[PDB]
Amino acid sequence: EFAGGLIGGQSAFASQEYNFDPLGLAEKFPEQLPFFREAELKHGRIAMLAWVGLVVPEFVRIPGPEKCWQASAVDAHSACVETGALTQVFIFCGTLEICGTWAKMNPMPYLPLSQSGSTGGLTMENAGDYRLGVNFLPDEPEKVKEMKLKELKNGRLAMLAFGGAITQATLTGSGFPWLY
Amino acid sequence: AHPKHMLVAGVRGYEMEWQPIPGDAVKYPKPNSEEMFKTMIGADVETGGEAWDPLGFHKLFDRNFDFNMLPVYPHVQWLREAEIKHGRVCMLAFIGCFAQAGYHIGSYPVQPDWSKALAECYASPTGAVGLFQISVLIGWIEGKNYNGDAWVGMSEKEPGDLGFDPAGFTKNPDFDLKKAQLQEIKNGRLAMVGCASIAANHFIPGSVPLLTGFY
Amino acid sequence: FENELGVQAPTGFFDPLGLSSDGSIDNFKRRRASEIKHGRVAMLATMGYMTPEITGKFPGYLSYSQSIKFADVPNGLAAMSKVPVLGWAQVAAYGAVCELSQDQSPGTPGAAGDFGFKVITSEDEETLKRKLNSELANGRLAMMAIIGLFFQDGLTGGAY
Amino acid sequence: YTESAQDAKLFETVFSTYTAEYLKGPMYETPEKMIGRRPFNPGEPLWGEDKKLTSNVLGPLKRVSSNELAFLTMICLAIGAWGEAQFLWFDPQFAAIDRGEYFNPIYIIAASLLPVSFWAHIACYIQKANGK
Numbered sequence: 001e002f003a004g005g006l007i008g009g010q011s012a013f014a015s016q017e018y019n020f021d022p023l024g025l026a027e028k029f030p031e032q033l034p035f036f037r038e039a040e041l042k043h044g045r046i047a048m049l050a051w052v053g054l055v056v057p058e059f060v061r062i063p064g065p066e067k068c069w070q071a072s073a074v075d076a077h078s079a080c081v082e083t084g085a086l087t088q089v090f091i092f093c094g095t096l097e098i099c100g101t102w103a104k105m106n107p108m109p110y111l112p113l114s115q116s117g118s119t120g121g122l123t124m125e126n127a128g129d130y131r132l133g134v135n136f137l138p139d140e141p142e143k144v145k146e147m148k149l150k151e152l153k154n155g156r157l158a159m160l161a162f163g164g165a166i167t168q169a170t171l172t173g174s175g176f177p178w179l180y
Numbered sequence: 181a182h183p184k185h186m187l188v189a190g191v192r193g194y195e196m197e198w199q200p201i202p203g204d205a206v207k208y209p210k211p212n213s214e215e216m217f218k219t220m221i222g223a224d225v226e227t228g229g230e231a232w233d234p235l236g237f238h239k240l241f242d243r244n245f246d247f248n249m250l251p252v253y254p255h256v257q258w259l260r261e262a263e264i265k266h267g268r269v270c271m272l273a274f275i276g277c278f279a280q281a282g283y284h285i286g287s288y289p290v291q292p293d294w295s296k297a298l299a300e301c302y303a304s305p306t307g308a309v310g311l312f313q314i315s316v317l318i319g320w321i322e323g324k325n326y327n328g329d330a331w332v333g334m335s336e337k338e339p340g341d342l343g344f345d346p347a348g349f350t351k352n353p354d355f356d357l358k359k360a361q362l363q364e365i366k367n368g369r370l371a372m373v374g375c376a377s378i379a380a381n382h383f384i385p386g387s388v389p390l391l392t393g394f395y
Numbered sequence: 396f397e398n399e400l401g402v403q404a405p406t407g408f409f410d411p412l413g414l415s416s417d418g419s420i421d422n423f424k425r426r427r428a429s430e431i432k433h434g435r436v437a438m439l440a441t442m443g444y445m446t447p448e449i450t451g452k453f454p455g456y457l458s459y460s461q462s463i464k465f466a467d468v469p470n471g472l473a474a475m476s477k478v479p480v481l482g483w484a485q486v487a488a489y490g491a492v493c494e495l496s497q498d499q500s501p502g503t504p505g506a507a508g509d510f511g512f513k514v515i516t517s518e519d520e521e522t523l524k525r526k527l528n529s530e531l532a533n534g535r536l537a538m539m540a541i542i543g544l545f546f547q548d549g550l551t552g553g554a555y
Numbered sequence: 556y557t558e559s560a561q562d563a564k565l566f567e568t569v570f571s572t573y574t575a576e577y578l579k580g581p582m583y584e585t586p587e588k589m590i591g592r593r594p595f596n597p598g599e600p601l602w603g604e605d606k607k608l609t610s611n612v613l614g615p616l617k618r619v620s621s622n623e624l625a626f627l628t629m630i631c632l633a634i635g636a637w638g639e640a641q642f643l644w645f646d647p648q649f650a651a652i653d654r655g656e657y658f659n660p661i662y663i664i665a666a667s668l669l670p671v672s673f674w675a676h677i678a679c680y681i682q683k684a685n686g687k
């Protein structure tokens with residue numbers, strides 16, 4: 001069926017599903033679709049954390065070298081790279097990403113995809129499944145699907161929200177309300 | 181004889197093949213060429229009413245089967261396609277050579293001389309875009325009417341039969357299209373001679389004793 | 396040739412010399428595609444002549460590289476020499492993707508203005524007739540007014 | 556029956572023809588016939604009896620339509636031509652380096668798309684010839 005039976009195409013109204021793909025990437029790349037869902041869920045999770053990390057520092061900020069921590073969101077990044085905070089955040093995120101995604105995806109993580117190819121570790125079922133906090137899932141398939149749909153909807157909302165927040169903050173500045 | 185494989189060019193039993201375009205089925209051409217030439221539009225009174233082809237350029241495709249069994253030399257259908265295209269391009273080129281010297285249209289650099297306008301429009305920031313648009317339009321109307329298969333004499337279309345006929349021609353019961361085709365071909369040859377004369381005058385002044393003051 | 400969405404209220408088969416052979420259905424189909432495309436383009440062009448005047452020119456720039464502003468491009472025929480020619484090339488590209496995406500060879504629906512747009516379609520064949528003839532009459536009036544505005548800009552030296 | 560030498564040659568021809576037509580199928584199982592050596596990849600025959608490339612020759616984009624590939628190659632060609640022109644002649648970037656300022660990444664990224672446009676239009680014609 002549409003998008004190999006992936007979760008996320010459900011519409012809010014009724015059984016009349018949305019299935020949003022005007023350019024038809026799901027049909028054109030059905031074997032690259034687990035990678036698409038991996039990228040979508042990863043972007044959504046990162047964007048959720050990023051919007052929360054755009055809102056929270058306007059309220060409370062950690063004590064630090066006073067150049068990265070005592071700065072606005074838009075100009076934080078450069079100073080934080082200079083202070084050595086974002087380099088350690090990059091070490092942490094890179095270790096997590098390499099191990100987790102690069103080993104769940106590449107059957108030969110010791111080799112780039114140009115040499116290993118394959119990429120069969122990402123199946124349609126285990127797309128966003130990093131086995132983290134799976135005991136919190138409801139014990140029935142319908143509510144599992146609903147929770148996955150909630151995660152996807154909130155992730156897309158967070159992608160758009162972070163994009164708007166960062167663009168408005170660059171345009172204007174301010175705090176949590178990024179209005180002029 | 182030799183097996184089905186191992187058949188290339190000069191091997192006995194090798195049927196001639198023509199597949200230059202990746203994505204198109206293989207076409208096996210018969211000699212033809214001379215046979216198509218014998219029933220070919222052209223050959224008016226100016227050369228005695230016979231098909232004036234010294235040097236035998238229309239017979240070389242037939243001689244391909246003797247040389248290496250490969251489509252090295254064009255079919256006479258390709259020769260007529262090239263003649264038609266050259267004639268049309270040279271008609272437009274002659275009119276452009278004698279219109280640019282007096283007229284100017286776009287934001288292109290003012291260059292009445294035909295031999296410098298192309299380069300000066302290459303250099304123009306607001307001329308390069310226009311020449312790119314001209315190039316893509318020409319490429320579209322050229323790849324759509326790719327012919328190409330006329331190189332081996334199977335074009336499925338009469339030479340110079342682009343999808344272009346805004347008027348009622350080729351459809352009216354009158355207006356014999358043979359005379360129109362002959363007029364087009366002969367005026368095209370005339371325009372090619374005119375363009376050669378323009379080039380000679382540009383390089384060797386006083387060659388054509390009518391464009392002495394021309395660029 | 397009657398019934399082909401061309402006869403209206405104050406006029407009939409208005410051909411002082413049009414359709415010179417009174418036949419040649421291929422010529423007439425080509426002319427129908429020609430007239431409907433002309434009318435749609437005209438309607439858009441008159442629309443875009445009377446939008447900037449009645450609603451102020453766009454707030455942006457239209458060219459950050461060439462430092463052009465929407466509010467600095469004159470409205471009318473003078474805009475062709477002011478809009479950066481890369482912009483006109485992109486307009487040409489949009490026209491290409493609008494003309495060559497769906498086929499409009501004779502016989503195809505594209506040769507009858509049927510490019511699958513709908514949006515303001517209808518449901519009943521008589522309502523279809525109403526909508527189609529409304530579009531065609533508005534397109535004819537457009538063509539007239541658009542060449543009139545062309546000449547007004549050319550002669551008066553300004554948009555009006 | 557006093558077998559003729561021509562009959563022996565006929566048997567040799569029959570044996571050769573039968574073997575040739577038999578070893579092609581999945582009853583010989585030789586390393587040459589292994590995927591990625593001589594065969595055409597299982598479900599993706601590149602060309603049929605006529606030597607016409609099928610849509611399988613495109614790989615991942617074997618089902619991208621001809622219109623979409625035409626749009627892709629035309630956009631890539633336009634962007635690459637703009638980048639090449641803006642890098643070499645109009646606002647040259649090497650002369651910008653001589654001015655002490657860095658390259659403009661937009662021009663390089665744009666100009667990178669010309670071979671993309673080349674292979675994209677080749678694939679576009681392959682799709683168009685296959686009816687895709």
Ligand code: CLA
Pocket residue numbers: 217220221222223224227230231232233236237238256259260261262263266369370372373376
């Ligand atoms: C390159 C352009 C070109 C091409 C492809 C053709 C092709 C053809 N012509 Mg044609 N022709 C041309 C230009 C061309 N013509 C010009 C400019 C004139 C005016 C003199 C003529 C006058 C002409 C006549 C009167 C006849 C043909 C005929 C033919 C057909 C058979 C001849 C043949 O095989 O020659 C194809 C191969 C070539 C033309 C090779 C050209 C390359 C040479 C070596 C260039 C040398 C010229 C050089 C620049 C000096 C300039 C001289 C000056 C007069 C300009 C064929 C379709 C005959 C026909 O219709 O048959 C039914 C026929 O009777 N042609």
Ligand SMILES: CC(=O)O[C@H]1CC(C)(C)C(=C=C/C(C)=C/C=C/C(C)=C/C=C/C=C(C)/C=C/C=C(C)/C=C/[C@@]23O[C@]2(C)C[C@@H](O)CC3(C)C)[C@](C)(O)C1
Pocket residue numbers: 048049051052132133134136154155157158160161162164165168176177178179
């Ligand atoms: C073993 C173990 O450990 O268990 C683990 C397992 C696991 C799975 C990791 C867990 C989890 C889940 C987590 C961590 C869930 C976190 C989810 C977050 C942070 C979602 C944020 C969404 C923000 C959005 C949509 C922002 C939306 C923002 C919007 C729409 C903003 C919109 C505007 O800003 C914009 C765009 C313009 C502004 O000017 C105005 C407004 C309107 C405000 C557990 C259970 O926890 C623990």
Ligand code: KC1
Pocket residue numbers: 285286287288306307308309310311313314317475476480483486487488490491
């Ligand atoms: C309605 C939309 C539209 C407008 C309004 C428009 C206007 C101008 N076009 Mg244009 N055009 C199309 C659409 C439009 N063009 C389309 C669909 C095609 C493909 C058939 C096409 C083709 C060409 C070519 C081949 C050239 C060209 C140019 C100019 C030019 C001069 C600019 C100047 O001299 O500054 C102006 C004002 C010439 C040029 O000089 O570009 C440097 C050039 O060579 N156009």
Ligand SMILES: CC1=C(C#C/C(C)=C/C=C/C(C)=C/C=C/C=C(C)/C=C/C=C(C)/C=C/[C@@]23O[C@]2(C)C[C@@H](O)CC3(C)C)C(C)(C)C[C@H](O)C1
Pocket residue numbers: 020074075077078160162163164166167170
């Ligand atoms: C700021 C800064 C930095 C930064 C940064 C970052 C991260 C910048 C990020 C910018 C970002 C992330 C910008 C997103 C844009 C999102 C867009 C355009 C989405 C459009 C989406 C659209 C138009 C969707 C429309 C529709 O949905 C509608 C409305 C209904 C649906 O039915 C149909 C569709 C889906 C079509 C550095 C580099 C890190 C350091 C530097 O020092 C300072």
Ligand SMILES: CC1=C(C#C/C(C)=C/C=C/C(C)=C/C=C/C=C(C)/C=C/C=C(C)/C=C/[C@@]23O[C@]2(C)C[C@@H](O)CC3(C)C)C(C)(C)C[C@H](O)C1
Pocket residue numbers: 409410411412413414433436437439440441443444469470471472473474475538539541542
């Ligand atoms: C919007 C805009 C711009 C624009 C634009 C564009 C694209 C404008 C387009 C203008 C356009 C499209 C102009 C053609 C009209 C078609 C006509 C006049 C056809 C007439 C045909 C007639 C009058 C024939 C009538 C007949 O009676 C005859 C003679 C015989 C009869 O038997 C049959 C009929 C009844 C058929 C600029 C200029 C680029 C910059 C500006 O800033 C912004």
